[PDB]
Coordinates of all heavy atoms in Angstrom, one line a residue:
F1 N -21.8 -63.5 -43.7 CA -22.7 -64.1 -44.7 C -22.4 -65.5 -45.1 O -21.2 -65.8 -45.3 CB -22.8 -63.2 -46.0 CG -23.3 -61.8 -45.7 CD1 -22.5 -60.8 -45.3 CD2 -24.7 -61.6 -45.9 CE1 -23.1 -59.5 -45.1 CE2 -25.3 -60.4 -45.7 CZ -24.5 -59.3 -45.3
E2 N -23.4 -66.3 -45.3 CA -23.3 -67.7 -45.7 C -22.9 -67.7 -47.2 O -23.6 -67.0 -47.9 CB -24.5 -68.5 -45.5 CG -24.9 -68.8 -44.0 CD -23.7 -69.4 -43.3 OE1 -23.3 -70.6 -43.6 OE2 -23.2 -68.8 -42.4
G3 N -21.9 -68.3 -47.6 CA -21.5 -68.4 -49.0 C -21.8 -69.7 -49.7 O -22.8 -70.3 -49.4
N4 N -21.0 -70.1 -50.6 CA -21.1 -71.2 -51.5 C -20.8 -72.6 -50.8 O -20.1 -72.6 -49.8 CB -20.4 -71.0 -52.7 CG -20.7 -69.9 -53.5 OD1 -20.0 -68.8 -53.5 ND2 -21.9 -69.9 -54.2
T5 N -21.3 -73.6 -51.4 CA -21.1 -75.0 -50.9 C -20.7 -75.8 -52.1 O -20.6 -77.0 -52.0 CB -22.3 -75.6 -50.3 OG1 -23.4 -75.5 -51.2 CG2 -22.7 -74.8 -49.0
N6 N -20.4 -75.2 -53.2 CA -20.0 -75.9 -54.5 C -19.3 -74.8 -55.4 O -19.2 -73.7 -55.1 CB -21.1 -76.6 -55.1 CG -22.4 -75.8 -55.3 OD1 -22.3 -74.6 -55.7 ND2 -23.5 -76.4 -55.0
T7 N -18.9 -75.3 -56.6 CA -18.3 -74.4 -57.6 C -19.1 -73.5 -58.5 O -18.7 -72.4 -58.8 CB -17.2 -75.2 -58.4 OG1 -17.8 -76.3 -59.0 CG2 -16.1 -75.7 -57.5
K8 N -20.3 -73.9 -59.0 CA -21.1 -73.2 -59.8 C -22.4 -72.7 -59.3 O -23.1 -71.8 -59.9 CB -21.2 -73.8 -61.2 CG -22.1 -75.1 -61.2 CD -22.1 -75.8 -62.5 CE -23.1 -75.2 -63.5 NZ -23.4 -76.2 -64.5
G9 N -22.8 -73.2 -58.2 CA -24.1 -72.8 -57.6 C -24.1 -71.4 -57.2 O -23.1 -70.9 -56.8
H10 N -25.3 -70.7 -57.4 CA -25.4 -69.3 -57.0 C -26.0 -69.2 -55.7 O -26.9 -69.9 -55.3 CB -26.4 -68.5 -58.0 CG -25.9 -68.3 -59.3 ND1 -26.7 -67.7 -60.3 CD2 -24.9 -68.8 -60.0 CE1 -26.1 -67.7 -61.5 NE2 -24.9 -68.4 -61.3
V11 N -25.3 -68.4 -54.8 CA -25.9 -68.2 -53.4 C -26.2 -66.7 -53.3 O -25.2 -65.9 -53.5 CB -24.9 -68.7 -52.4 CG1 -25.5 -68.2 -51.0 CG2 -24.9 -70.2 -52.4
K12 N -27.4 -66.3 -53.2 CA -27.8 -64.9 -53.1 C -28.1 -64.5 -51.6 O -28.8 -65.2 -50.9 CB -29.0 -64.7 -54.0 CG -29.4 -63.2 -54.1 CD -30.5 -63.2 -55.2 CE -30.7 -61.7 -55.7 NZ -31.7 -61.8 -56.7
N13 N -27.6 -63.4 -51.2 CA -27.8 -62.8 -49.9 C -28.3 -61.4 -50.1 O -27.9 -60.6 -51.0 CB -26.5 -62.8 -49.1 CG -26.1 -64.1 -48.5 OD1 -26.9 -64.7 -47.9 ND2 -24.9 -64.6 -48.8
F14 N -29.4 -61.1 -49.4 CA -30.1 -59.7 -49.4 C -29.6 -58.9 -48.3 O -29.3 -59.4 -47.2 CB -31.6 -59.9 -49.3 CG -32.2 -60.5 -50.6 CD1 -32.6 -61.9 -50.7 CD2 -32.5 -59.7 -51.7 CE1 -33.1 -62.4 -51.8 CE2 -33.1 -60.2 -52.8 CZ -33.4 -61.5 -52.9
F15 N -29.4 -57.6 -48.6 CA -29.0 -56.7 -47.5 C -30.2 -56.0 -46.9 O -30.9 -55.3 -47.5 CB -28.0 -55.7 -48.0 CG -26.8 -56.2 -48.6 CD1 -26.4 -56.0 -50.0 CD2 -25.9 -57.0 -47.8 CE1 -25.2 -56.6 -50.5 CE2 -24.7 -57.6 -48.4 CZ -24.5 -57.3 -49.8
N16 N -30.5 -56.4 -45.7 CA -31.6 -55.9 -44.9 C -31.1 -55.2 -43.6 O -30.9 -55.9 -42.7 CB -32.7 -57.0 -44.5 CG -33.4 -57.4 -45.8 OD1 -34.2 -56.7 -46.4 ND2 -33.3 -58.7 -46.1
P17 N -30.9 -53.9 -43.6 CA -31.2 -53.0 -44.7 C -30.2 -52.8 -45.8 O -29.1 -53.4 -45.6 CB -31.3 -51.7 -43.9 CG -30.2 -51.8 -43.0 CD -30.3 -53.2 -42.5
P18 N -30.5 -52.2 -46.9 CA -29.6 -52.1 -48.0 C -28.3 -51.3 -47.6 O -28.4 -50.6 -46.7 CB -30.4 -51.3 -49.1 CG -31.8 -51.7 -48.8 CD -31.8 -51.7 -47.3
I19 N -27.3 -51.4 -48.4 CA -26.1 -50.6 -48.2 C -26.1 -49.4 -49.1 O -26.5 -49.6 -50.3 CB -24.8 -51.5 -48.6 CG1 -24.7 -52.7 -47.6 CG2 -23.6 -50.6 -48.6 CD1 -23.6 -53.6 -48.0
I20 N -25.7 -48.3 -48.7 CA -25.8 -47.0 -49.5 C -24.3 -46.6 -49.6 O -23.8 -46.1 -48.6 CB -26.5 -46.0 -49.0 CG1 -28.0 -46.4 -48.7 CG2 -26.5 -44.7 -49.9 CD1 -28.8 -46.5 -50.0
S21 N -23.6 -46.8 -50.7 CA -22.2 -46.4 -50.8 C -21.7 -46.6 -52.2 O -22.4 -47.0 -53.1 CB -21.3 -47.3 -49.8 OG -21.3 -48.6 -50.2
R22 N -20.4 -46.2 -52.4 CA -19.9 -46.3 -53.7 C -18.9 -47.5 -53.8 O -18.8 -48.1 -54.9 CB -19.1 -45.0 -54.0 CG -18.3 -45.0 -55.3 CD -17.5 -43.7 -55.4 NE -16.5 -43.9 -56.6 CZ -15.5 -43.1 -56.8 NH1 -15.4 -42.0 -56.1 NH2 -14.7 -43.3 -57.8
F23 N -18.1 -47.8 -52.7 CA -17.2 -48.9 -52.8 C -17.7 -50.1 -51.9 O -18.2 -49.8 -50.8 CB -15.8 -48.5 -52.2 CG -15.2 -47.4 -53.0 CD1 -15.5 -46.1 -52.9 CD2 -14.0 -47.8 -53.9 CE1 -14.8 -45.1 -53.6 CE2 -13.4 -46.9 -54.5 CZ -13.7 -45.5 -54.4
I24 N -17.5 -51.3 -52.4 CA -17.9 -52.5 -51.7 C -16.7 -53.4 -51.7 O -16.0 -53.6 -52.6 CB -19.1 -53.2 -52.5 CG1 -20.4 -52.5 -52.2 CG2 -19.3 -54.7 -51.9 CD1 -20.9 -52.6 -50.7
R25 N -16.5 -54.0 -50.5 CA -15.3 -55.0 -50.3 C -15.9 -56.3 -49.8 O -16.7 -56.3 -48.8 CB -14.2 -54.5 -49.3 CG -13.1 -53.7 -50.1 CD -12.1 -53.3 -49.1 NE -11.1 -52.5 -49.7 CZ -9.9 -52.1 -49.2 NH1 -9.6 -52.4 -48.0 NH2 -9.1 -51.3 -49.9
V26 N -15.6 -57.4 -50.4 CA -16.0 -58.7 -50.0 C -14.8 -59.2 -49.3 O -13.7 -59.3 -49.9 CB -16.3 -59.6 -51.2 CG1 -16.6 -61.0 -50.8 CG2 -17.5 -59.0 -51.9
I27 N -14.9 -59.7 -48.0 CA -13.9 -60.2 -47.2 C -14.0 -61.7 -46.9 O -14.9 -62.1 -46.1 CB -13.7 -59.5 -45.8 CG1 -14.0 -57.9 -46.0 CG2 -12.4 -59.8 -45.1 CD1 -12.9 -57.2 -46.7
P28 N -13.3 -62.5 -47.6 CA -13.5 -64.0 -47.4 C -13.1 -64.5 -45.9 O -12.0 -63.9 -45.5 CB -12.6 -64.6 -48.4 CG -12.5 -63.6 -49.6 CD -12.4 -62.3 -48.7
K29 N -13.9 -65.2 -45.3 CA -13.6 -65.6 -43.9 C -13.2 -67.1 -43.9 O -12.3 -67.5 -43.2 CB -14.8 -65.4 -43.0 CG -15.1 -63.9 -42.7 CD -13.9 -63.4 -41.9 CE -14.0 -61.9 -41.7 NZ -12.7 -61.3 -41.0
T30 N -14.0 -67.9 -44.6 CA -13.7 -69.3 -44.7 C -13.9 -69.8 -46.2 O -14.7 -69.2 -46.9 CB -14.7 -70.2 -43.8 OG1 -16.0 -70.1 -44.3 CG2 -14.6 -69.8 -42.4
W31 N -13.1 -70.7 -46.6 CA -13.1 -71.2 -48.0 C -12.8 -72.7 -48.1 O -12.3 -73.3 -47.1 CB -12.1 -70.4 -48.8 CG -10.7 -70.4 -48.1 CD1 -9.7 -71.3 -48.2 CD2 -10.3 -69.3 -47.2 NE1 -8.6 -70.9 -47.5 CE2 -8.9 -69.7 -46.9 CE3 -10.8 -68.2 -46.7 CZ2 -8.1 -69.0 -46.0 CZ3 -10.0 -67.4 -45.9 CH2 -8.6 -67.8 -45.5
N32 N -13.2 -73.3 -49.2 CA -12.9 -74.7 -49.5 C -11.8 -74.7 -50.4 O -11.8 -74.1 -51.4 CB -14.1 -75.4 -50.0 CG -13.7 -76.9 -50.3 OD1 -13.3 -77.3 -51.4 ND2 -13.9 -77.7 -49.3
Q33 N -10.6 -75.2 -49.9 CA -9.4 -75.3 -50.7 C -8.7 -74.0 -51.0 O -7.5 -73.8 -50.6 CB -9.6 -76.1 -52.0 CG -9.0 -77.4 -52.0 CD -8.7 -77.8 -53.4 OE1 -9.6 -78.6 -54.0 NE2 -7.7 -77.3 -54.0
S34 N -9.3 -73.1 -51.7 CA -8.7 -71.9 -52.1 C -9.7 -70.8 -52.2 O -10.9 -71.0 -52.5 CB -7.9 -72.1 -53.4 OG -7.1 -71.0 -53.8
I35 N -9.3 -69.5 -52.1 CA -10.2 -68.4 -52.2 C -10.4 -68.0 -53.7 O -9.4 -67.6 -54.4 CB -9.6 -67.1 -51.5 CG1 -9.5 -67.3 -50.0 CG2 -10.5 -65.8 -51.8 CD1 -8.7 -66.2 -49.3
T36 N -11.5 -68.2 -54.3 CA -11.9 -68.0 -55.6 C -13.3 -67.5 -55.7 O -14.2 -67.9 -54.9 CB -11.8 -69.2 -56.6 OG1 -12.8 -70.2 -56.1 CG2 -10.5 -69.7 -56.7

């Protein structure tokens, strides 16, 4: 998924199709300077 390009801008991604579950994990692949 394409993420942010700045510090406060919101980047929204839709799940097509949706995810049906209880636990969700976000795994950072690339980051600018540091993972935040």
Side-chain angles (χ1 to χ4, degrees):
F1 291 90
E2 291 305 298
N4 302 103
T5 55
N6 50 45
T7 54
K8 66 184 280 195
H10 291 184
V11 172
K12 188 173 195 178
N13 282 305
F14 288 97
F15 299 119
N16 287 295
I19 292 173
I20 303 284
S21 66
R22 177 184 167 189
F23 296 78
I24 283 291
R25 268 185 185 185
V26 172
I27 320 294
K29 288 295 172 187
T30 62
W31 49 87
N32 180 263
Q33 249 205 262
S34 189
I35 296 168
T36 56

